Amino acid sequence: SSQLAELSEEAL
Amino acid sequence: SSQLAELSEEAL
Amino acid sequence: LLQIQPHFHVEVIEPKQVYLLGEQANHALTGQLYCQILPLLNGQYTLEQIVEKLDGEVPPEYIDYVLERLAEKGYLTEAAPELSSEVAAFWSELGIAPPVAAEALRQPVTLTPVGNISEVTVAALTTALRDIGISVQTALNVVLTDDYLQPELAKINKQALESQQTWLLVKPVGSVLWLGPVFVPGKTGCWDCLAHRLRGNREVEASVLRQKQAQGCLPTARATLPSTLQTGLQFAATEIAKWIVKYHVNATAPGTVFFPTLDGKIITLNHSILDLKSHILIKRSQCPTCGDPKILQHRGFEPLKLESRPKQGHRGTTPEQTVQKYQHLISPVTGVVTELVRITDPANPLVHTYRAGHSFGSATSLRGLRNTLKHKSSGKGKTDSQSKASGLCEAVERYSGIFQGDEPRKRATLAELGDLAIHPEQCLCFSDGQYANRETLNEQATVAHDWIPQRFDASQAIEWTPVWSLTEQTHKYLPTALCYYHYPLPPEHRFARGDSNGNAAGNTLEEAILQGFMELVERDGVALWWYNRLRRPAVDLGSFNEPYFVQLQQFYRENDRDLWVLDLTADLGIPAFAGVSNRKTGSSERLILGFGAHLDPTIAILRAVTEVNQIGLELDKVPDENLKSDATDWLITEKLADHPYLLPDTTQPLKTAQDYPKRWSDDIYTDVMTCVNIAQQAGLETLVIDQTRPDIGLNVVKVTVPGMRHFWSRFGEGRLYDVPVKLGWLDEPLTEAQMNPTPMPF
Amino acid sequence: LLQIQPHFHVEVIEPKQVYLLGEQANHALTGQLYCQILPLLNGQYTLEQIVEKLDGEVPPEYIDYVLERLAEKGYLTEAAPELSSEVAAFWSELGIAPPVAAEALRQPVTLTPVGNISEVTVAALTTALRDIGISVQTTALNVVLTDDYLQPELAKINKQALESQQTWLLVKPVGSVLWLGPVFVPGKTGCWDCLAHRLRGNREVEASVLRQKQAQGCLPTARATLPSTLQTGLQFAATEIAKWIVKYHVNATAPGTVFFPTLDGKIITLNHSILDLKSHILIKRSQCPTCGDPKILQHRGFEPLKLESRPKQGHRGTTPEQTVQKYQHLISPVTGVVTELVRITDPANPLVHTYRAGHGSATSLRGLRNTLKHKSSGKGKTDSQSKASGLCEAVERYSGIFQGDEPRKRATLAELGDLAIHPEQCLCFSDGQYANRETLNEQATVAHDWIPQRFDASQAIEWTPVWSLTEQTHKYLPTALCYYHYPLPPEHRFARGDSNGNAAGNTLEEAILQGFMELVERDGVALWWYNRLRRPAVDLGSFNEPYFVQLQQFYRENDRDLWVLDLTADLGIPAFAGVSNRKTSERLILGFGAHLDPTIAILRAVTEVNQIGLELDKVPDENLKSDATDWLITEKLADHPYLLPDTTQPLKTAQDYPKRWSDDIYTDVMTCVNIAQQAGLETLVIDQTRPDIGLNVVKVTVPGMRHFWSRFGEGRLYDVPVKLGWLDEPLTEAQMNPTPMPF
């Protein structure tokens, strides 16, 4: 599912 | 005098 | 009334000796009379009282000579009754007589909160200050903030400059206490001199703030135990007291007391990990608020003035002397260099490498933000001290070139300027076919360096920056967008991004112009070799009177690597080389490249193989999945079989030390004038823009020789095609289509 | 109740990004659903209450996947209602869930004042702790407040704590320098005695004054106190107490998983006067008499000396830069053994590299001013090699100071018989010198030439076991020689420990090599100086090294000349002496090097010349206060022909020194021991290595070899120069050089 798939998290 | 001559002060 | 310095603890060794034990200093007195008298100098007695207790034992005349001698050397004081014994001790241990210290604290102080700082919190500092004898309401205004970039601080700063008010700044909330500086209008930087640096070192916060404009500062001081708050406020109270006092005692026994305060300094105490660092604030000459912002403008339009610089190894001074002179620029707060770290295993004496944290530009997207922050500097060298100087000075070179807005500029169209102006296409050298398929190419591009800008529109009046022509001894003009990093251009006329090509720092301008010229020579030589894919001869490293070459070769062999050096010396004749190393074992060959050029072929080869060292060893220990360098796809996929122009030409003979004639001299300046004449009979003009920043000191320039080539995929008509033919390397030029489809990875 | 980690400022940029901004770290969330949900992960809202805020805007299944995705990633925790938003933010920034921190802070604590700490001051800490949710009991941690870290009560406390298995903290919030830490965990960290051992050696003035006073427990100086420094220290303490209370609680739940630092085995010093914070490390002493077993050294002294092969890469097993990194922890005026390590190298000069290390009992001001002057000097071609030299020489000295746990046994020379070695074999003083002992010492420039009382063999003295490499067995020297500052009766002071043959190294066999070379170095110089021999200079161009030629050029620009004489004697081990005068006071300087590799030996010499000379040279002559000053001011090269090279002899070169070293240090040691065996010499070693230090330190003794101090006893000082033909007939004692070797 598109809404759920694009969830990315990363540190800066 | 000797009592006045021997007066000495120093840091260590 | 009379007492001995309260901080001293007295112990009498009865025949001859009397010791004064302190917390930071220990003194010793000799004389039978001292043993007799000092017991009576504890603040329990007056000069009138002392004589009667030892009347008939020590003459009255004799006591004075003793008390005189104790005064000249400052062991003796009179008790200040407004102070307790413990307080008096604190200042006397700093060489300050109690009665003077009491007078000092009478100087009053004002407190001003700003931002979200609690009115409760202000009251806590007021209570702290009164506890040490400082009244509140002048001599000092103290400002309590949660963020050193609060817009309100701008207005407080400008009144202090107009009123010549000396003031202090503090941030006790959050998990890192900020304390200082004490601004002294005329003697130290202003808040804006500081704020200019803060704005640079906050890259993600600054890139978040504009991004919101897709649709002042951000407060990030939320972690606060009531103890860290009180820790920070109480700590501030001490330093406030120490400033108040020293200002008083450095005028009233000038000299005498010499202890540090917060003038021009910022102190960060990290409550979490427990680390205390000091940070020097530099007063910017060009500061718009307290200085003259028209400095660079005036300088940029003035003739470049060079002079003789003998050499001591082709620089004027040692690296450690260079590092010493510019350490203070290393501060994540007040500095330009965030961190400077030795990433080298000290088990290996040959390989040195430093990582200099760089602040750089600002971005307006999450994708663009991570391209910054990836932007780090790096130090390479044969030795540690030189590898250190390299890392430091590369970071400063980068900062200096960033467009601050005070740069020498003027509006005009290319026609109003005449032959004095230089069309950007002379420098960029993009092909007609590239401009035509800009958008397509740029999208399906593996790398950010391959970015093809829009064509320059000569009808638009742009900003031009004056540059000094060493060949023609006069000013010319490049568009400002080329001369400095991150010059903002309109979205419908983005004809350039400022690159790093020709940028160089140095202890002198001539030192810098020389190194910058050599950067151009190398990128040119690489370009010719890489894109024409010329087979080049290797160098016989043993023919040079330098063991470090063979020592390095052996080291690489033990560590699953080979190492060789291709000669890329082109039509200018200046020695340029390409270090090439590859792994023997594994799924990946991990080809790595290091380049270098210099009048001295030894130095030139050094520069190359130490560039191979800094990249090389640090990737190898790191497995393939863990690799996230820019050249990642290159290190895993690409084998030496795919690029035979990387390994040397067995057809040609090995180049030796005897093959590179000496054209350098005893003078750096002479070497500069030598290079500019080399460019001249290759039909090239040599331009210099001095990017040096007064606040920085270290000289930075950008050398530009229009027509010379670069690492990056730019296939315009010029030296990229013709020089290989002029040198016999090719029998006929290639077409743009036969150029190397694989970009230069590094 | 749910919330994103409190220490983050949540910023939502509408399209698809939500930025989590912290003070020390930053994060980025991408995805449209985050923009909708995170404005409601502020701590106010339940998982259930969320839906009405967005039912029909987002289905709950999408929400659960987000939370579970945010949760296992490390951005989501549950609120704790007991803690403020700011308190929670602090513990979350250290990676600790608010509900965990809350149950950790219930844990009570005990305070114990010692010294002259006020009862009010104790209340202030109780108050500071009370304000951050920590209560005091009238436990898990016992906090001790003191006004001096050597208050004798701390011994009793430390003993009880060890037997009680009690964790405790030490703090000193009075005086200009806050001391904070360490947290003593019995059985994991050193005891207070481990710390106190170091503090007694690092406070020599206070220590002597006690000796001078008692001859007729500690001395407190923490008088310099502001209300603000005191509070600063209590509050600082309360914050680190809290950090230890939390750490403990979590390591019971799941050992590890907490990687923020605490004061366990660590001491913080914050100086209020000058403003600087320094972190000190407390090494647990394995031979500690309180928490440790002090019998290590006594055993080891009597165990055979195990040597093995050591590969090589300039003649050491590991780089100097390594060596410093791994023994840096000894550089500390508190916990450490070396006070500081300073470059005096003007960075404008790349050739000259000298470091000054930091550094002793005395019973008088005079004896006290002599101590504190003693400081080790770093010498080397490279700044890194010089840095290591400086650091290691300091540890070389300390490791040899007699602590009382060294290997010995009391007996007369007769009982031991053949295994014992008379100290007069090592010292080599003449019957004349012993006879005129009292006069000769009064009339002595420097105290290196101190003539001890004659040994009395009827007396039962303490003998130390020493390993004979040649005979591969244990011999015995008097303990008075094998260690510095060993106390002897005033009627029988037959020796002082000297620095001769003492050396350090990353390995034992590394040290013995240097220790032996230190002996060759001295013996050679003695033969040249006291016989006043004329020796040839060395052609420094013949050697491949260009440092020599460049260094000579430097001295010339700096009003000086420089040459190198050969002192190689019957052992044939390359020995050299560098000499330099001012061509404009002459200020003669001498440096000495010895090694199998002559190029290193030249190097050892010349670098030692730079250490001494140039630093003294920039100073004007009338002001100088050094030990060898009179020689630098008055003496002239004309009055000492033996200092300049004999023009009659040919210049030495690289070809005149054969190679006898190998790829293994051990082999070189086996070579050196046999070279001494042919000369009729036994080689002896004592392991001075301290476990708490780690760096290997030995004393090599080869009885009969000469020191360059005035010791005119019959032996190799007369015989060897004849054996090699430097003299047709032996000199006499009266004939020896009456001017002592001044360095």
Ligand SMILES: Nc1ncnc2c1ncn2[C@@H]1O[C@H](COP(=O)(O)O)[C@@H](O)[C@H]1O
């Ligand atoms: N000893 C030095 N003094 C001044 N600038 C230096 C020194 N070493 C390197 N740099 C500068 O540091 C930057 C990077 O050096 P490199 O890594 O050698 O290309 C260049 O701008 C150099 O001119």
Ligand SMILES: Nc1ncnc2c1ncn2[C@@H]1O[C@H](COP(=O)(O)O)[C@@H](O)[C@H]1O
């Ligand atoms: N790189 C090193 N590693 C271990 N010990 C060293 C090193 N350099 C010097 N030392 C020791 O430091 C002391 C002084 O050295 P030197 O000044 O060369 O006589 C001697 O005990 C040496 O063994």
Ligand SMILES: [Ca+2]
């Ligand atoms: Ca550069």
Ligand SMILES: [Ca+2]
């Ligand atoms: Ca480079």
Ligand SMILES: [Ca+2]
């Ligand atoms: Ca030594």
Ligand SMILES: [Ca+2]
């Ligand atoms: Ca030495």
Ligand SMILES: [Zn+2]
């Ligand atoms: Zn300013």
Ligand SMILES: [Zn+2]
């Ligand atoms: Zn212990």
